[PDB]
Design a protein around this nucleic acid. Structure first.
Lengths: 158, 144, 139, 56, 99, 114
RNA sequence: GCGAAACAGUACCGUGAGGGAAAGGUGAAAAGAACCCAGAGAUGGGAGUGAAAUAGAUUCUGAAACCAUAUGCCUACAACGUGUCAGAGCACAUUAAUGUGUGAUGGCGUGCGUUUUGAAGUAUGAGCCGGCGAGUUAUGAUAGCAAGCGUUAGUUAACCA
RNA sequence: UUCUCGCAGUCAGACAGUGGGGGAUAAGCUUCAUUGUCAAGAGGGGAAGAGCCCAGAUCAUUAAAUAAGGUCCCCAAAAUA
RNA sequence: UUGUGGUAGACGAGCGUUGUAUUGGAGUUGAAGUCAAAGCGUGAGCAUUGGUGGAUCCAAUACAAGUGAGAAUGCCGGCA
């Protein structure tokens, strides 16, 4: 800002009896090198407070909307060991499920190492825990693969 | 929208006219001369292009006025040097420069245009009854 | 068929160079040296060498004639100016300009080249209108 | 004094209209083929059929 | 011969195979409009119009005049406004008229 | 995030300058003066958009009067005899243009007399 | 953008505490131009290299005030905040548009900001041009609009994950 | 145009008619009331203007009839007694 | 049907710039900036081909701003 930068606080010219203007400190916004009158400061919260009930209602609405569409399916714990850390099996499964041009988002209540290790080298899909999924992530996928066991906690969560 | 109103395209066919000043009053003679020169009564007159006639006037010194203007109406001409005010009377102009009187009178009523100094040169006067435009073969008419 | 010659960074005022160029422009080459190297002007001496070099380039590097050629355009353009300072009375400060110039000359072999440039301009606008037509023909 | 309104390029052009230098008259020497000045000697010397300078 | 026709908001002089321009009448090109409001057909003087006198006319084209950006500027006061306008019109010729 | 306006400023200035075409002097290049010049030009255009409607009516009446001088009567009585009897909603402009075809306006001149 | 992208608290000013700059970019790679011509030389034109030399060391992109040269048009009797509306004549042919460029002639006319009872001003501010060049943000309150929750409602703050 | 509420700006007025005060029935003077205009509003008449007279300019049109004023010409329209 | 001169100033309806989010696309078969055109909108504006030029950019919807230049006897730089 104006006074933060280093610079002479002296008057470059006598105020009167001079051809030039009344300009004072040489670090004013008129001169070059700095002296911005208005500029962003490192203390701005940028927080957008929203009531909890509205957030819960929005989450329930997006769950209901995306659950009743013909792009989400159920996945159980059985094939989380058939699929290994290696992504070859994951790529074959993706090709079988014709999701090569989709952005399906995973949701599970176990967080197995085999699934997390895979799909980390691909940006189309990602795995997440129930406690960390958000509305934007829930709806940007346009398709979901949901674990059956998670449904109990889902209906408990309202 | 519009009919694209007809305007002249510099068609300058101009007749020659002679008027007998057998004792005409200066004002009416001047306005009639201005009317004849400007072609104001021409059927398709356009004030955007030059379209007029040539007027020859005879017996400049025979032109007479009315009332006591012979000793009341005065003409002043100015020269750019200070003190140069030529003051003349009606009779003096009638006897000394009567061609100048009618010339200036007909010049004054012309609109102050660039064509004003070009429209004026179409008039010509003579103190006597002898003219030099005979080669143009002019036709005369009275009271114009 | 132009075979012009250029010259850069000449220490001479543009106005005098333009004056002498206008004096010499529009003539042949034989009279050029006589009408140019016999005038008390500093810029004339440099233009003499410039015209000699132009004649040499025309006769050698492009295969032109030695008599049908004539000077076509002599101009003077403000070159890269350099600024210094000079003191004045009562400690005054002024910025003095040290002017420079750019001088080029042009030769021709025949009275045209006043229309060939116009021919190229016509070709350019013809290309523009042809492109416009071709774009319009994609409906 | 100084000007009170700036001079236009038209004004300076009309002022310098008289700047064009005259075409100096020349003459051909009678023995040294060259275009010299008028009433003046050429680089050889024979102002007429008579010399004055050595070589230059 | 010489005819005087009235259309849109103005009147026009009409000869054989002549064309002119009028305001739009929401009529497509192709239909032959029978202009009714005509006055002073040669050697006939009717006071408001000429009774049962019409001239048939085929529309030629629809056109838009050049842009005119009228600007009203109030001198030395805080005010500045711009406005542009185009006036559609129709070009039309004459083919036949009846006495 | 700082934003500097380079493109739109140039576009606006070039558009302003382009309207200043056919002028005299540096008024066709100095944007700060070209804008004032074209503003004054627009003001004059607006005023003359009614001045021309006045002047064309003036010239139409002048030429009609001039044409009537060859028949003996005056313009005022001609307008009267047009209006108070033999009513005619006829253009003064076309009554003037009727002189292009000779002797056709003379028919109306004769007929307007009851 | 740190005053400081390049041998910046340097060059520079001041005997002093001290004040305090400006400029970056060829080209994929120098392959940075053998040799010839003009010139004493710089240098330029040819040749060649390189996709391109309008990339040639003035080294990415190259608008404006600057001034040259030229096709097309006009002006040397003319009173001019210079343009508008008509209008020939002249030459041309476009994003086909009742087309374009110039303006012999006619009608009309006293800029822009600011501060002002009041501006063509004989008050004022501006040489032009190019860029930069001010109503935001933190924390509160009131009110309008909209939303969740709904009538023992509503809501979290600091804080932990 | 009365009423709660959001948010204002405005505190240098001038002129013409009308009635008075100051002034000497002098001011393009001042101080008031009052009717309008400008102020913050274009055009026409008055030759040229902020106040005078007609009056409300949304734009375009080369269309008609009037308002104040004017009609030999500039510069639009007329004559008759 | 009425109404649309208008500074301060209240108020609605809007265009442009940068970046993020995304769905679509263009891109040495040539994008940006930039030069010139005799086009399209009620507007701040926006198409088109032609030369320049060698890498990013465009449509549409929201979000957030160092976001719109004619002065400040303004500021540097260049030029009359």
């Amino acid at each position: 800002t104006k006074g933060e930068v280093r610079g002479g606080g002296k008057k470059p010219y006598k105020q009167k009896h001079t051809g030039k203007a009344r300009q004072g400190s040489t670090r004013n916004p008129h001169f070059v090198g700095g002296g911005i009158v208005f500029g962003p400061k490192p203390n701005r919260n940028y927080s957008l407070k929203l009531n909890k009930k509205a957030h819960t209602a929005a989450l329930h609405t997006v769950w209901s909307e995306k659950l009743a569409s013909d792009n989400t399916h159920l996945v159980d714990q059985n094939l989380f060991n058939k699929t290994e850390g290696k992504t070859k099996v994951m790529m074959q499964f993706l090709k079988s499920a014709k999701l090569l041009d989709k952005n399906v988002l995973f949701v599970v209540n176990t967080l197995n190492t085999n699934l997390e290790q895979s799909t980390s080298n691909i940006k189309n899909v990602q795995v997440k825990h129930l406690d960390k999924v958000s509305v934007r992530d829930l709806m940007l996928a346009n398709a979901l693969l949901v674990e059956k066991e998670v449904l109990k906690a889902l209906e408990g969560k309202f | 929208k519009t009919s694209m109103l007809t305007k002249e395209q510099a068609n300058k066919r101009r007749q020659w006219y002679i008027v007998d000043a057998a004792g005409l009053v200066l004002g009416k003679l001047a306005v009639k001369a201005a009317d004849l020169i400007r072609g104001k009564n021409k059927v398709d007159f356009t004030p955007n292009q030059d379209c007029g006639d040539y007027l020859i006037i005879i017996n400049s010194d025979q032109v007479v006025l009315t009332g006591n203007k012979k000793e009341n109406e005065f003409w002043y001409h100015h020269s750019q040097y200070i003190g140069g005010i030529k003051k003349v009377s009606g009779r003096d102009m009638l006897k000394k420069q009567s061609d100048k009187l009618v010339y200036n009178a007909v010049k004054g009523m012309l609109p102050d245009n660039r064509l004003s100094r070009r429209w004026i040169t179409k008039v010509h006067v003579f103190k006597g009854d002898k003219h030099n435009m005979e080669a143009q073969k002019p036709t005369t008419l009275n009271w114009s | 068929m132009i075979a012009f010659a250029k010259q850069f960074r000449v220490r001479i005022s543009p106005q005098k160079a333009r004056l002498v160029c206008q004096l010499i422009v529009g003539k042949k080459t034989a009279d050029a040296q006589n009408i140019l190297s016999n005038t008390p002007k500093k810029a004339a001496t440099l233009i003499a060498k410039l015209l000699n070099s132009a004649i040499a380039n025309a006769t050698n590097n492009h295969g032109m004639n030695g008599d049908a050629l004539y000077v076509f355009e002599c101009v003077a353009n403000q070159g890269p100016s350099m600024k210094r300072t000079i003191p004045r009375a009562k400690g005054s400060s002024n910025m003095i300009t040290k002017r420079s110039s750019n001088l080029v000359v042009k030769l021709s072999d025949n009275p045209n080249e006043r229309q060939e440039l116009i021919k190229q301009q016509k070709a350019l606008v013809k290309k523009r209108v042809e492109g416009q037509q071709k774009a319009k023909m994609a409906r | 004094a100084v000007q009170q309104r700036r001079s236009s390029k038209h004004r300076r052009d009309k002022r310098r209209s008289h700047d064009a230098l005259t075409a100096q008259a020349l003459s051909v020497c009678q023995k040294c083929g060259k275009k010299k000045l008028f009433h003046r000697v050429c680089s050889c010397g024979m102002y007429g059929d008579l010399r004055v300078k050595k070589a230059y | 011969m010489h005819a005087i026709v009235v259309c849109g908001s103005k009147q026009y002089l009409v000869h054989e195979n002549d064309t002119f321009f009028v305001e739009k009448l929401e009529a497509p090109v192709g239909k032959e409009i029978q202009l009714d409001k005509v006055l002073m057909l040669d050697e006939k003087i009717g006071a408001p119009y000429l009774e049962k006198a019409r001239v048939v006319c085929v529309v030629e084209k629809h056109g838009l005049q050049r842009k005119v950006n009228v600007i009203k500027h109030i001198s030395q006061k805080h005010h500045l406004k711009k406005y542009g306008h185009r006036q559609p019109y129709t070009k039309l010729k004459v083919v036949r008229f009846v006495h | 995030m700082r934003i500097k306006g380079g493109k739109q400023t140039r576009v606006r200035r070039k558009k302003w300058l382009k309207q200043a075409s056919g002028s005299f002097g540096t008024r066709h290049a100095s944007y700060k003066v070209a804008k004032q010049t074209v503003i004054q030009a627009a003001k004059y255009a607006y005023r003359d958009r009614r001045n021309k409607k006045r002047d064309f009516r003036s010239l139409w009446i002048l030429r009609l009067n001039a044409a009537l001088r060859e028949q003996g009567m005056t313009y005022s009585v001609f307008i009267n005899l047009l209006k108070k009897h033999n009513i005619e909603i006829n253009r003064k402009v076309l009554s003037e243009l009727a002189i292009k075809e000779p002797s056709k306006f003379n028919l109306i001149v004769q007929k307007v007399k009851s």
